[PDB]
Amino acid sequence: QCVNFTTRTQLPPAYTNSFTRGVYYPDKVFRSSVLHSTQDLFLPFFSNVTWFHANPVLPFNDGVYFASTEKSNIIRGWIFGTTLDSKTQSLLIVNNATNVVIKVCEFQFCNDPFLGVYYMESEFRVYSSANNCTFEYVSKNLREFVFKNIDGYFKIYSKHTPINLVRGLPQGFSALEPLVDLPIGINITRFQTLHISAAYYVGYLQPRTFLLKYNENGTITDAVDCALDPLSET
Amino acid sequence: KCTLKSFTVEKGIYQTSNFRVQPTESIVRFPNITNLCPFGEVFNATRFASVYAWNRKRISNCVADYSVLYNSASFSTFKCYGVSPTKLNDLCFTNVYADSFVIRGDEVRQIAPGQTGNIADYNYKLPDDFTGCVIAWNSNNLDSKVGGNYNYLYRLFRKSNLKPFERDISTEIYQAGSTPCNGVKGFNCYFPLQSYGFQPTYGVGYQPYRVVVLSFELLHAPATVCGPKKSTNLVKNKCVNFNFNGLTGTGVLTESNKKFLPFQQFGRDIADTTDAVRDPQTLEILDITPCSFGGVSVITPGTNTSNQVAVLYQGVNCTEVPVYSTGSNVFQTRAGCLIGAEHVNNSYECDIPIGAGICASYQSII
Amino acid sequence: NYNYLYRLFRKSNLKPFERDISTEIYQAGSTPCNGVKGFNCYFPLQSYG
Ligand SMILES: *[C@@H]1O[C@H](CO)[C@@H](O[C@@H]2O[C@H](CO)[C@@H](O)[C@H](O)[C@H]2NC(C)=O)[C@H](O)[C@H]1NC(C)=O
Ligand SMILES: *[C@@H]1O[C@H](CO)[C@@H](O[C@@H]2O[C@H](CO)[C@@H](O)[C@H](O)[C@H]2NC(C)=O)[C@H](O)[C@H]1NC(C)=O
Ligand SMILES: *[C@@H]1O[C@H](CO)[C@@H](O[C@@H]2O[C@H](CO)[C@@H](O)[C@H](O)[C@H]2NC(C)=O)[C@H](O)[C@H]1NC(C)=O
Ligand SMILES: *[C@@H]1O[C@H](CO)[C@@H](O[C@@H]2O[C@H](CO)[C@@H](O)[C@H](O)[C@H]2NC(C)=O)[C@H](O)[C@H]1NC(C)=O
Ligand SMILES: *[C@@H]1O[C@H](CO)[C@@H](O)[C@H](O)[C@H]1NC(C)=O
Ligand SMILES: *[C@@H]1O[C@H](CO)[C@@H](O)[C@H](O)[C@H]1NC(C)=O
Ligand SMILES: *[C@@H]1O[C@H](CO)[C@@H](O)[C@H](O)[C@H]1NC(C)=O
Ligand SMILES: *[C@@H]1O[C@H](CO)[C@@H](O)[C@H](O)[C@H]1NC(C)=O
Ligand SMILES: *[C@@H]1O[C@H](CO)[C@@H](O)[C@H](O)[C@H]1NC(C)=O
């Protein structure tokens, strides 16, 4: 149940700097006050971030860093897949107050996928149909997320932080804890971002090498890019 | 003598072998387990569909305890074809499929690899390579009706047979002859489906029998569906072997005060050596210490002189010695545990250096 | 031909070049056999079709 829209809002994408954000815990192994070198798919430091202020379709590539600097739980929905229709197994995610809810099958979407708020909200008109599937899973502020998919396992790493800077990303460091794991394998090439009735940043990750520092409590406090510049390589 | 391959030994200290404390018992502690598959709705279902309309169910991502199914004696027929039922709780595949229906008592044997029949050719056909099990049981008191239960139908007429894992519910008027029929029965046109006449008064082999066939699937997705595991009792302060959630190894387990963030499961110190684990059941941080070991050594005054020796255990506390379990007055030193040589309070020069500033000589042995 | 036989159930395995000819009921399940197969007990020998 949906129709088209006339206010075809396409604000041109701006570009900004990533600084030192987008580090997540690689392993489930506790460590204490140690420097560990690891090769993994990370967001390279001081890279280009494609700032968005309708919603296009972006390639997923290997792994995607997604950030939303919102106020009081704005961001809700995510759509992932190769064809994003009833031809190929699609994936849908809705963030909820407690946790996230995930549906894995073929939903038929229109040009304007949106949730809708009624003024207490009750409106679910993002898609139109869903024939067959099995997998369903249920469990001011910048919310960061890292989405990855490796060998039949889709992983979502989450983080919430408070900030008062208005323009861009802050100059801070915070490791991204693992939140959700999925032992499911479906082909994904593209994804979108869902509207509600708002600026967000997107970044693309590459396989590189990093050095991490663990404090006495098993938390990451500092990271160094291996192959960025001579000092960091040393 | 065996080590030196000689019948005479000169005075001195010789390394012979090593002492290692053996394990005492095995402790396995797997997590709290959950997510049992819904078998109850299968074998306690209100009603099963027709044989040619056999109900298909998929089971995935849940623990499937086959012990309760196996030990139950309420099912007349329990025939597993692919593998033995006993080991099903050990090995498992990535999916399960259940085919539930009702047949006659005589048709029970028809559902097997290398079997043919009206059901096996017009209602449900299985491959000769089929692996799994079949569970059949009489339901005369339930499915059969005193007035004749015709709710169950079976395909009787069909031009061709049924392929394996194929369900057909077509109601096409079977045309045995060459005379076409426009949906109306005639001389050479009949109904392929016939209603069963299940009744309580019917004899053995005619009563309704509910049959559910279980098969196991190996799609390239990881295996997720099989029986639960076993959890032993945790012990402490004893050199034992453990299987904590797949992390297997030996050592002595004590209590630790270290802190884990709520998402790690186990830690390590350096060089990837497991040093602390959390029990997957009560969520507390334990600690692992290697079982004590160390080479043994022999101090002798020379085969020519005498024939009594002293034994040294390197870097082992004098708490666990064990024929040399008691011997003579045991002496404890920093270098290790010394057996057979009595301690004196005097001070002479050194004959056979022992370690940590202490050493022995021949008076007996001192 | 039903004159040829094979063992299918046993308590454990067998040593190399070791032949076992003990023809006894096998306690397949927890139910004791007590000389009768009944349930959880079956004859561990079978022929070839
Ligand atoms: C590591 O975690 C421990 C356990 O909480 C911290 O120790 C206490 O932490 C609380 C809250 O974080 C503080 O209110 C206490 O003052 C801390 N006490 C001590 C003695 O540290 C500890 O601060 C954390 N960080 C480090 C580096 O140990
Ligand atoms: C169908 O219902 C019966 C009766 O409730 C179940 O039999 C019980 O199974 C549990 C399994 O843990 C046992 O602990 C009980 O002792 C059983 N009771 C009786 C009277 O047999 C049966 O398990 C159900 N079917 C399935 C497939 O679960
Ligand atoms: C598995 O979960 C059960 C949930 O009940 C745990 O049982 C509780 O354990 C706590 C901590 O020891 C007790 O305070 C409760 O009284 C227990 N409730 C019961 C037994 O109903 C259990 O500890 C968990 N771990 C296992 C079983 O290994
Ligand atoms: C050898 O083992 C004995 C135990 O029989 C140790 O003595 C104990 O040591 C602990 C730790 O220092 C103390 O808390 C106990 O009070 C001691 N008990 C007794 C009876 O002495 C001894 O320390 C161990 N020696 C070595 C070198 O490891
Ligand atoms: C990103 O690239 C654009 C051109 O493609 C450039 O104008 C901009 O300065 C770049 N930003 C960063 C942070 O590198
Ligand atoms: C999150 O899910 C719970 C579980 O149904 C629900 O009670 C709660 O209202 C949800 N949060 C929302 C809708 O913001
Ligand atoms: C992805 O597509 C390839 C070929 O296009 C196929 O072999 C593979 O099974 C697919 N993986 C999925 C659907 O998870
Ligand atoms: C053994 O010791 C005695 C006394 O010192 C000596 O006479 C003899 O030669 C020794 N024999 C050997 C084989 O060392
Ligand atoms: C050494 O001195 C201690 C101190 O009391 C005494 O108990 C022990 O018997 C003495 N041993 C010898 C061999 O003199």
Offer a quick outline of the entry.
It is classed as viral protein. The structure is cut from a larger assembly and holds 3 copies of chain A. Chain A has 234 residues and is mainly β.
Oligomer: part of a larger assembly
CATH C-level of chain A = Mainly Beta
What best-fitting shape of chain A do the alpha-carbon axes yield? globular
Query: Helix content range of the residues of chain A, please?
Result: under 10%
> Order of strands in the sheet with the most strands of chain A?
5-14-7-8-9-10
Tell me the structural class of chain A. Answer: mainly beta
Which strand-content bin applies to the residues of chain A?
over 45%
C-alpha-based Rg of chain A, rounded: 19 Å
Main interface by residue count: A-B, 17 and 19 residues
N-to-C span of chain A: 58 Å
The CATH architecture of chain A can be given as Sandwich
What is the CATH topology classification name of chain A?
A: Jelly Rolls
| Biggest sheet statistics of chain A | 6 strands, antiparallel
PDB class: viral protein
Keywords: SARS-CoV-2, Spike protein, viral protein
Entry title: Cryo-EM structure of SARS-CoV-2 S-Beta variant (B.1.351), Cleavable form, one RBD-up conformation
Chains A, B, C: Spike glycoprotein
Report on this model:
- The structure is cut from a larger assembly and holds three copies of chain A.
- Chain A is an all-beta fold.
- Chain A has one domain (14-234): Sandwich (Jelly Rolls), CATH 2.60.120.960.
- Chain A has one helix and 17 strands.
- Chain A has one helix spanning 230-233, and strands at residues 14-17, 29-30, 34-42, 48-51, 58-59, 63-70, 77-81, 91-95, 100-109, 127-138, 141-150, 153-162, 177-182, 190-193, 200-204, 206-214, 220-225.
- In chain A, a hairpin with a 5-residue loop joins strand 16 (206-214) and strand 17 (220-225).
- The longest helix of chain A is centred in the C-terminal third of the chain and has 4 residues, at 230-233.
- The radius of gyration of chain A is 19 Å and the shape is globular.
- In chain A, 21% of the residues are buried.
- Chains in contact: A-B, B-C.
- Strand 2 (29-30) of chain A pairs parallel with strand 14 (266-268) of chain B.
- The structure holds a molecule of 2 linked components (NAG-NAG) (4 copies) and 2-acetamido-2-deoxy-beta-D-glucopyranose (5 copies).
- Chain B: Disulfide bonds join 37-62, 80-133, 92-226, 181-189, 239-291, 318-337, 350-359.
- Chain B: Residues 149-157 are annotated as: Immunodominant HLA epitope recognized by the CD8+.
- Chain B: Residues 35-228 form the BetaCoV S1-CTD domain.
- Chain B: Residues 20-242 are annotated as: Receptor-binding domain (RBD).
